[PDB]
Design a protein around this ligand. Structure first.
Ligand code: CLA
Ligand code: CLA
Ligand code: CLA
Ligand code: CLA
Ligand code: CLA
Ligand code: CLA
Ligand code: CLA
Ligand code: CLA
Ligand SMILES: CC1=C(/C=C/C(C)=C/C=C/C(C)=C/C=C/C=C(C)/C=C/C=C(C)/C=C/C2=C(C)CCCC2(C)C)C(C)(C)CCC1
Ligand SMILES: CC1=C(/C=C/C(C)=C/C=CC(/C)=C/C=C/C=C(C)/C=C/C=C(C)/C=C/C2=C(C)CCCC2(C)C)C(C)(C)CCC1
Ligand SMILES: CC1=C(C/C=C(\C)CCC[C@H](C)CCC[C@H](C)CCCC(C)C)C(=O)c2ccccc2C1=O
Lengths: 215, 52, 31, 183, 35, 731, 99
């Protein structure tokens, strides 16, 4: 089973029953209670879905030549005062989240409104779920990169890519205002798996008394 | 408890002589409630952990 | 030439790594 | 078996099972079996790196280029930051794979092939040839570094300078010439 | 000083968040019955 | 209820004491459940690694804070008109006047003025910019992480050193003397010759250009040729300006002796030469013991051979090698005694012979450093004697040391304690009598009746060093004497110029006040030593408790029988000796501070006349120098000294709080706690909440420890606040 | 003043000759009387310290007097120390005499 680095030894509780199990959890956040792990997975899926929708919207507005996504909040002109929009969104989201809560409390998964599984096309399966999990994770990192590029650089998802393609050796993260910090991260991460291997060699994999983040 | 805990900071807090004292104190009481909340949780986790 | 913000951030990250090594040593000592 | 010193015996822990075993261990560092195996692998790795380094230094110096100790201060297509980052990631992955391959099989290798022996040519005679060549390369690299420290000249240029007048252009003469060079 | 905002975040973290977390964890650990 | 993982007996305690004792006995590995010698040594080794990492992190933090919020670069340009900045201040409780009052050395906001002297030290070793300090902090951070990894690595079975490896005393001493001491000193000499010396001459030499700069014009040739004298050709001129090239030189290994005229500190070339000689001697000493190369010494044979005939010393030192190698407490006691003595030596040498540039001019830093090192030395000495007692009660074997020096010194412990008591009684009787006599004659308005004994012996020793203020004309005081002519053209010129000047602390002038205070110091030392020695020698047993060794090093008592046995264990002796050590260190620091206070203000007459009686000490030193401190904050406002005034009151409060645990004992509190428990178990609403551990009063030994901790903390905090506020508000 | 080559060579040769023909008997007697370091009655190697095992390149040498290579290094070190002390003292041109 592929892991988060070649030859990685997954934790004892990360046998592989769950989807997208790459044996990654250095802090051992979901190694105590199984219900908490299920809730964590539901939260991960929700964040991933929101990230995919956000990434798709940001990319679509950039491809059509619209202004920056981070600045688009003040460039929207239409009816309904800001307070009215806030109230409408809060009420509709409260009812939607209540329905989602009921769906999770019943079928253990997400849903849309009264529909517990919400699958008009009947495209539900363990193979399709893994696609959703991986796509959501990729979209989450994509949105994180979007925000990071908008903060460090003054470009968008397409402009940053164009700048990198123009000069890949001089237009990278290590040459920006956060390059030094980045250089310190890679250098550490580059030796993180090997160091872990040492622990698995000199100390062994016989579990530990405590957990990094117990919670 | 939460209702009776605002008054003290309202009339005696460091920013009591400012018009925005009510808001600051509401936040202070919320913080105090959260603190005594973790206190209740710790007491429950330590007291109830076994049967007899 | 005062130290910049990036230098402080790098020092804090290195300190975080050092703290991780320290907690590992403490766990090994507890055993 | 020939020993590094005439009239002595091997330090017991060394009996010839390893390539290039000359009974040289005055300090007795290999008194631990596991540590001895790790030290043998480390010696091979250091020798290979030194061999590649010496070959590269000599090759670049023959084709002109810049001094081996001044190549880092040159200008390349990418800055030192991104260059070091990319190298760190690549070397980390390669070394991680090499270490994992050593855990399963206590031998050398590359990527996922342990041992990495394409086209064969592996034999006890080749094992000692690599160890001896590697040791010579490490000694040569140390000589290169110290010579460059005293005389800011490359290996070939230093050899030619010595051949011009060996009795007054050696390591003893380099100490007196230090004020004329440094500064 | 560079990054004037750092002390305003680190001081409360080391004096309020870290001590509360450490005391809670220590209190929960010194009364576990089976460690 | 099983937290004391190392003590199963403590885990069964159903009271709160289990938690208390669970923390006070965490480092006593020898008393933990299922503990062996190998595991003990391995745990100690890993703990040493952790401590080293902590020290490295502390130094890195100091460097980072100075380079991030300090004024090191500005202080370099004006080392005499700028106050060093320790770190910034971010306190939400500060008011506007407090924020404005703590802004001093040109800082953006409130900061703390440094008092540890790191600025002078870093400036003297070659550091000049903030980037260098940041680089050093990062390097120390990496070093700390490396040591942490080493500590974790040596705890693994593949890298666990055997117990015999820890007993290899010859190899360890060889490597520590030749490598830890010699090689380190040689490396420091290299740094001084390559960076410190060139930097002090206005030439910058860093990692980017140290390979293209010659430390000396004639590089390495004189060293290998033997012409070492060529390295001391032209030293820094007497009109040299630090950090600049005016009046500089090219020498790197001089021996002028004395102090730099501008910085008022030792010459860098002299310190480099000192470190080089020290490195050579230490390496040579390191090549003494036998390891695995057929040559060297065997400490066991040397000890077994140190047996004088006639049996004056009995068996001599037979079995001492094993007594020291097998017992960890013996080694710890020896190390603590040596470290404490060295700390005292460091404190006594840094004020009389300033080694850092512009350090003598910083009166606050000098006083703080001296007091800090003296207090550290006192605590370390108490620990040394305490561990010696622990050794006698836990690792001493009478059969293995039958007839050697240990058994013989224990055979006549009564004579030792009796003579210590006699010396203490004599010193106390006479010192107090002379002080009271002077006080009485001063009160009656007759100062001419004072008993002022001239310290002729100390004055004679001072004259032997070159001081001509007493008209002795002895060795170095006579220009025609053999020692005077021998070093006439070596170090004597500068040494004499510095010792005959009253503008420095190199052998200050002494009088009757110094005589009385020195005898008071002798009293404190003798009484503290008497308490510690009596506790260590009587640790195994006395007439009142013949089987004391069977009860361990620390225990509450032996009951009220046989007349009473309160404070009878060796731990109690150490406990009583801590008070005396604090008193002795207080007397020493009071003397040093008052003398230097009068010297800095150019008024030696104040101390010369008011130190002969105690009223002068209380009025002209404590009450006189406390005006600015107690005025840090008043009904009119506050200044930067408010922090010291608050710390002053804080120390007084902690000290008084400790008085409670010291005077009140366990009995009253147990009944009071029982009453409180009854009240809680009978109060409605609160009945829903129960305690997991039965509340009980503090233990007898625990109470003594808490009281001593409070007493010491209040003592140190109060004196630190007073010292810094008094010497900082004036200079 | 003093030739570094001549002084160093003479001092090293003299030290080696003294340690090989003059001080060898007393050195051997002292070594036999002292022996290897022992802890609790047994050598460090016997107690379990593998790194404390005596090196084999000194156990026996082809020299008829048993003069090992370590002996050569020790005596050469003493000779060099004396030679450099003489050279350094002769290099200085100051008056150190107490007369
Ligand atoms: C320890 C091994 C080692 C190391 C660290 C270096 C390092 C370096 N070499 Mg070198 N080289 C080596 C071995 C090594 N070499 C050997 C064995 C040879 C003989 C085949 C050469 C022949 C060589 C030449 C002809 C040149 C260098 C050059 C350089 C410098 C720039 C290289 C570059 O642009 O990246 C390029 C990256 C790649 C080509 C991709 C890697 C391809 C893999 C290894 C296959 C650099 C400091 C250049 C220089 O500036 O001279 C100083 C240069 O012109 N090297
Ligand atoms: C032992 C050394 C030491 C000490 C005593 C201090 C002390 C202080 N630091 Mg500092 N720090 C240190 C090291 C140290 N630091 C190092 C090495 C770095 C480089 C990463 C920093 C970086 C740093 C920053 C960026 C800031 C401080 C700040 C502060 C102040 C508030 C504390 C805080 O909340 O910040 C938090 C401190 C950290 C997040 C890093 C410190 C980590 C150290 C090394 C832990 C050492 C633990 C110790 C060895 C074990 C003792 C046991 C104990 C925990 C029970 C305080 C006076 C703040 C300040 O300036 O106040 C105005 C501030 O913003 N420090
Ligand atoms: C060592 C760390 C530390 C820190 C960072 C603080 C920080 C603070 N203290 Mg505190 N204090 C401390 C230690 C500390 N204290 C200790 C050890 C003691 C015992 C001696 C005290 C005793 C003390 C008292 C008696 C008081 C403070 C008060 C305050 C607040 C200052 C007034 C203000 O800003 O308005 C108000 C602060 C806020 C509006 C922010 C706090 C609420 C946050 C946002 C919580 C968010 C939770 C949210 C509701 C959900 C401030 C947040 C004063 C205060 O106002 O009480 C809070 C005050 O009365 N402190
Ligand atoms: C050359 C080889 C070598 C070296 C360099 C060391 C070095 C060290 N060993 Mg080690 N050891 C060795 C060989 C060596 N050892 C061998 C062969 C053995 C087996 C026989 C051991 C067995 C061993 C054990 C069991 C332990 C050590 C420990 C230590 C550390 C001592 C504690 C310390 O750091 O304080 C540093 C000491 C000094 C710097 C010298 C002190 C000089 C004086 C007292 C200070 C004053 C100097 C100067 C005035 C200061 C001014 C500076 C100021 C401006 C700030 C230290 C780093 C201990 C340790 O801590 O474990 C990690 C320990 O437990 N060693
Ligand atoms: C290299 C130094 C060193 C080392 C390694 C040891 C090691 C050891 N000591 Mg020892 N000791 C030392 C120095 C040292 N000591 C010194 C300098 C003193 C003089 C003070 C002592 C006096 C001493 C005594 C009397 C005893 C030991 C004991 C012990 C053993 C157990 C320690 C323990 O139980 O941990 C526990 C650690 C603690 C309980 C921490 C103490 C809490 C401190 C004192 C409070 C500090 C509060 C802080 C300053 C407040 C800040 C103020 C602020 C809030 C305003 C252990 C092997 C005990 C023993 O041998 O058992 C038989 C024993 O009884 N030591
Ligand atoms: C100011 C307080 C104070 C004083 C004066 C003393 C005095 C003394 N301590 Mg003590 N000590 C103190 C505090 C004090 N201690 C505290 C707080 C502790 C911690 C609990 C200790 C713990 C301690 C220990 C453990 C020991 C001492 C010892 C001693 C004696 C040492 C011998 C000596 O110095 O000769 C000088 C004698 C004096 C200075 C006493 C004054 C003599 C008087 C004034 C003369 C009488 C004249 C007149 C007739 C008075 C009578 C009037 C009356 C009839 C109305 C000494 C009497 C040691 C000891 O017993 O020595 C053998 C001992 O072992 N002390
Ligand atoms: C200055 C030293 C000192 C102090 C502070 C105390 C304090 C106290 N004594 Mg005590 N006592 C002392 C000296 C001292 N004593 C001495 C020398 C003796 C020997 C004769 C005694 C003998 C004695 C007896 C026999 C008794 C007491 C009792 C008490 C308690 C009475 C209850 C009270 O006052 O309410 C409140 C407490 C205080 C006012 C103390 C100051 C606390 C401050 C104001 C609060 C600060 C909050 C804190 C800073 C915030 C947390 C910060 C965080 C970092 C922890 C009290 C805690 C009686 C008792 O048990 O209680 C009924 C009792 O019977 N004492
Ligand atoms: C530790 C290894 C080592 C070894 C094996 C040697 C060996 C030797 N050294 Mg050397 N040396 C060493 C370390 C060493 N050295 C170090 C570390 C230094 C720096 C202080 C020196 C500095 C040094 C000097 C300055 C000289 C030697 C010389 C010599 C040679 C003396 C020949 C002779 O006796 O002249 C002949 C005997 C007579 C004329 C009678 C000799 C082969 C001398 C030399 O070169 O020989 C000519 C010489 O001048 N050494
Ligand atoms: C075999 C043989 C022989 C012999 C030979 C020989 C004799 C050789 C040699 C050799 C040598 C010849 C050796 C020596 C050695 C050693 C050494 C050489 C060392 C050293 C060094 C040192 C230790 C130094 C130090 C120092 C320094 C570094 C600096 C300054 C100071 C001092 C000086 C301290 C014969 C012919 C008889 C016979 C047959 C064969
Ligand atoms: C109890 C005990 C212990 C501990 C002990 C101790 C703590 C000790 C100490 C001590 C000390 C703390 C000491 C000190 C010292 C010092 C000395 C001994 C010195 C001296 C002197 C000299 C010799 C000098 C000389 C000189 C010079 C050199 C020059 C100038 C002049 C003069 C004179 C100064 C032990 C464990 C061990 C054992 C058992 C128990
Ligand atoms: C006041 C007093 C008590 C009562 C004190 C008790 C019961 C302790 C009260 C402490 C409370 C629980 C708060 C703790 C205060 C400290 C700030 C805790 C810090 C400790 C941590 C670092 C672990 C005794 O039991 C006693 C026993 C024997 C001699 C003298 C005395 C004595 O003087």
């Amino acid at each position: 089973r592929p892991t988060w680095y070649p030859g990685a030894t997954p934790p004892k509780y990360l046998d592989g029953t769950m989807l997208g199990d790459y044996g990654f959890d250095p802090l051992r956040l979901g190694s105590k209670d199984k219900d908490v792990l299920k809730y964590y997975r539901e939260g991960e899926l929700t964040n991933g879905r929101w990230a995919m929708a956000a990434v798709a919207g940001i990319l679509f507005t950039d491809l059509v030549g619209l202004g920056p996504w981070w600045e688009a909040g003040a460039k929207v002109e239409s009816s309904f005062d800001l307070k009215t929009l806030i109230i409408i969104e809060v009420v509709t989201f409260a009812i939607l989240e209540g329905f989602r809560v009921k769906a999770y409390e019943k079928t253990g998964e997400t849903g849309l409104g009264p529909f517990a599984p919400f699958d008009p096309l009947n495209m539900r399966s363990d193979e399709t779920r893994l696609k959703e999990l991986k796509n959501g994770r990729l979209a989450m990192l994509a949105f994180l990169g979007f925000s990071s590029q908008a903060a460090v650089q003054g470009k968008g998802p397409i402009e940053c890519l164009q700048a990198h393609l123009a000069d890949p050796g001089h237009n990278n993260i290590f040459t920006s205002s956060v390059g030094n910090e980045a250089l310190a991260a890679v250098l550490v991460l580059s030796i993180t798996p090997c160091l872990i291997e040492a622990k698995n060699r000199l100390q062994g994999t016989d579990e530990e008394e405590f957990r990094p983040l117990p919670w | 408890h939460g209702y009776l805990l605002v008054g003290p900071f309202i009339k005696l807090g460091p920013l009591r002589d400012v018009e925005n004292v009510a808001e600051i104190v509401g936040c202070i009481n919320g913080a105090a409630t959260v603190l005594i909340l973790t206190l209740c949780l710790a007491y429950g986790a330590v007291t109830f952990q076994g049967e007899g | 030439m005062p130290i910049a913000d990036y230098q402080v951030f790098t020092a804090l990250f290195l300190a975080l790594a050092t703290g991780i090594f320290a907690v590992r040593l403490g766990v090994a000592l507890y055993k | 078996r020939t020993l590094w010193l005439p009239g002595i015996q091997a330090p017991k822990h060394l009996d010839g099972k390893l390539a290039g075993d000359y009974g040289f261990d005055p300090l007795g560092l290999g008194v631990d079996s596991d540590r001895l195996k790790w030290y043998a692998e480390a010696e091979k790795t250091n020798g290979r790196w030194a061999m590649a380094a010496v070959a590269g230094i000599l090759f670049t110096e023959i084709l002109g280029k810049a001094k081996w100790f001044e190549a880092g201060a040159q200008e390349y297509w990418m800055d030192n930051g991104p260059l070091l980052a990319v190298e760190a990631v690549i070397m980390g992955f390669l070394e991680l794979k090499r270490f994992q391959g050593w855990k399963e099989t206590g031998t050398s290798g590359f990527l996922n092939a342990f041992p990495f022996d394409p086209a064969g040519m592996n034999s006890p005679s080749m094992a000692t040839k690599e160890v001896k060549n590697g040791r010579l390369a490490m000694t040569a690299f140390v000589g290169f570094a110290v010579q460059a420290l005293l005389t800011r000249q490359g290996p070939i240029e230093a050899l030619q300078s010595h051949l011009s007048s060996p009795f007054t252009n050696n390591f003893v003469g380099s100490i007196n010439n230090l004020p004329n060079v440094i500064g | 000083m560079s990054a004037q905002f750092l002390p305003s975040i680190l001081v409360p973290l080391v004096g309020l968040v870290f001590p509360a977390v450490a005391m809670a964890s220590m209190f929960l650990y010194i009364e576990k019955e089976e460690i | 209820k099983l937290f004391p993982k190392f003590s199963q007996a403590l885990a069964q305690d159903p009271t709160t004491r289990r938690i208390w004792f669970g923390i006070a006995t965490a480092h006593d590995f020898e008393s933990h459940d299922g503990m062996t010698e190998e595991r003990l040594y391995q745990k100690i080794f890993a703990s040493h690694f952790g401590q080293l990492a902590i020290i490295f992190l502390w130094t890195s933090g100091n460097l980072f804070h100075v380079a991030w919020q300090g004024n090191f670069e500005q202080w370099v340009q004006d080392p005499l008109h700028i106050r060093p900045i320790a770190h910034a201040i971010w306190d939400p409780h500060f008011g506007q006047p407090a924020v404005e009052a703590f802004t001093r050395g040109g800082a953006s906001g409130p900061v703390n003025i440094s008092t540890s002297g790191v600025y002078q030290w870093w400036y003297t070793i070659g550091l000049r910019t903030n980037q260098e300090l940041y680089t050093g902090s990062i390097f120390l951070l990496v070093l700390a992480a490396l040591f942490l990894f080493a500590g974790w690595l040596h705890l693994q079975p593949a890298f666990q050193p055997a117990l015999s490896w820890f007993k290899n005393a010859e190899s360890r001493l060889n490597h520590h003397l030749a490598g830890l001491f010699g090689v380190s000193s040689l490396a420091w000499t290299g740094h001084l010759v390559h960076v410190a010396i060139p930097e002090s001459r206005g030439q910058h030499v860093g990692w980017d250009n140290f390979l293209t700069v010659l430390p000396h014009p004639a590089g390495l040739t004189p060293f290998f040729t033997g012409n070492w004298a060529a390295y001391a050709e032209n030293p820094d001129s007497a009109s040299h300006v630090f950090n600049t090239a005016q009046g500089s030189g090219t020498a790197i290994l001089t021996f002028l002796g004395g102090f730099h005229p501008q910085t008022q500190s030792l010459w860098l070339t002299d310190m480099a030469h000192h470190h080089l000689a020290i490195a050579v001697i230490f390496i040579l000493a390191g090549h003494m013991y036998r390891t695995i190369f057929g040559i060297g010494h065997s400490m066991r044979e040397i000890l077994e051979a140190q047996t004088p005939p006639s049996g004056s010393l009995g068996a001599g030192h037979k079995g001492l090698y094993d007594t020291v190698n097998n017992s960890l407490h013996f080694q710890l006691g020896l190390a603590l005694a040596s470290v404490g003595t060295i700390s005292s030596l460091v404190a006594q040498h840094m004020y009389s012979l300033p080694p850092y540039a512009f350090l003598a001019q910083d009166f606050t830093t000098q006083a703080a450093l001296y007091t800090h090192h003296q207090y550290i030395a006192g605590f370390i000495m108490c620990g040394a004697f305490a561990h010696g007692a622990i050794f006698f009660v836990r690792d001493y074997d009478p059969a293995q040391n039958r007839g050697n020096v240990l058994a013989r010194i224990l055979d006549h412990k009564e004579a030792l304690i009796s003579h210590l008591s006699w010396a203490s009684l004599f010193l106390g009787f006479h010192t107090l009598g002379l002080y009271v006599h002077n006080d009485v004659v001063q009160a009656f308005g007759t100062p001419e009746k004072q008993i002022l004994i001239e310290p002729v012996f100390a004055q004679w020793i001072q004259a032997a060093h070159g001081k001509t203020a007493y008209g002795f004309d002895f060795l170095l005081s006579s220009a025609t004497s053999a020692p005077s002519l021998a070093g006439q053209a070596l170090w004597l010129p500068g040494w004499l110029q510095g010792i005959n000047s009253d503008a420095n602390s190199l052998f200050l002038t002494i009088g009757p006040g110094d005589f009385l205070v020195h005898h008071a110091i002798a009293l404190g030392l003798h009484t503290t030593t008497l308490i510690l020695v009596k506790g260590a020698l009587d640790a195994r047993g006395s007439k009142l408790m013949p089987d004391k060794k069977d009860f361990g090093y620390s225990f509450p008592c032996d009951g009220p029988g046989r007349g009473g046995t309160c404070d009878i264990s060796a731990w109690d002796a150490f406990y009583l000796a801590v008070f005396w050590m604090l008193n002795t260190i207080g007397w020493v620091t009071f003397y040093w501070h008052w003398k230097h206070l009068g010297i800095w203000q150019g008024n030696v007459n104040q101390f010369n006349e008011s130190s002969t009686y105690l009223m002068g000490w209380l009025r002209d030193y404590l009450w006189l120098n406390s005006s600015q401190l107690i005025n840090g904050y008043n009904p009119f406002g506050m200044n930067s000294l408010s922090v010291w005034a608050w710390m002053f009151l804080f120390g007084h409060l902690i000290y008084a709080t400790g008085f409670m645990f010291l005077i009140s004992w366990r009995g009253y509190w147990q009944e009071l706690i029982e009453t409180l428990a009854w009240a809680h178990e009978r109060t409605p609403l609160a009945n829903l909440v129960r305690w997991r551990d039965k509340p009980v009063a503090l233990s007898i030994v625990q109470a003594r420890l808490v009281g001593l901790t409070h007493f010491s903390v209040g003592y140190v905090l109060t004196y630190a606040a007073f010292l810094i506020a008094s010497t900082s508000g004036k200079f | 003043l003093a030739d570094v080559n001549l002084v160093v060579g003479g001092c090293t040769v003299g030290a080696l000759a003294l340690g090989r023909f003059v001080f060898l008997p007393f050195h051997r007697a002292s070594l036999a009387k002292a022996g290897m370091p022992k802890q609790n009655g047994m050598t460090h190697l016997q107690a379990g310290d593998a790194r404390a095992e005596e090196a084999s390149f000194i156990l026996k040498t082809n020299d008829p007097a048993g003069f090992t290579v370590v002996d050569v290094m020790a005596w050469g070190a003493l000779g060099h120390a004396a030679a450099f002390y003489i050279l350094a003292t002769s290099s200085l041109g100051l008056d150190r005499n107490p007369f």
